[PDB]
Amino acid sequence: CRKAGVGQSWKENSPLNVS
């Protein structure tokens, strides 16, 4: 997908932290 490759199994909780 856009933020992760798989879906939502990566680091999660917004695209970084600050923005």
Side-chain angles (χ1 to χ4, degrees):
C1 304
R2 189 177 183 178
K3 296 168 185 167
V6 72
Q8 281 105 316
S9 187
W10 57 299
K11 73 98 207 174
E12 303 96 77
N13 192 83
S14 254
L16 42 148
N17 263 324
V18 177
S19 193

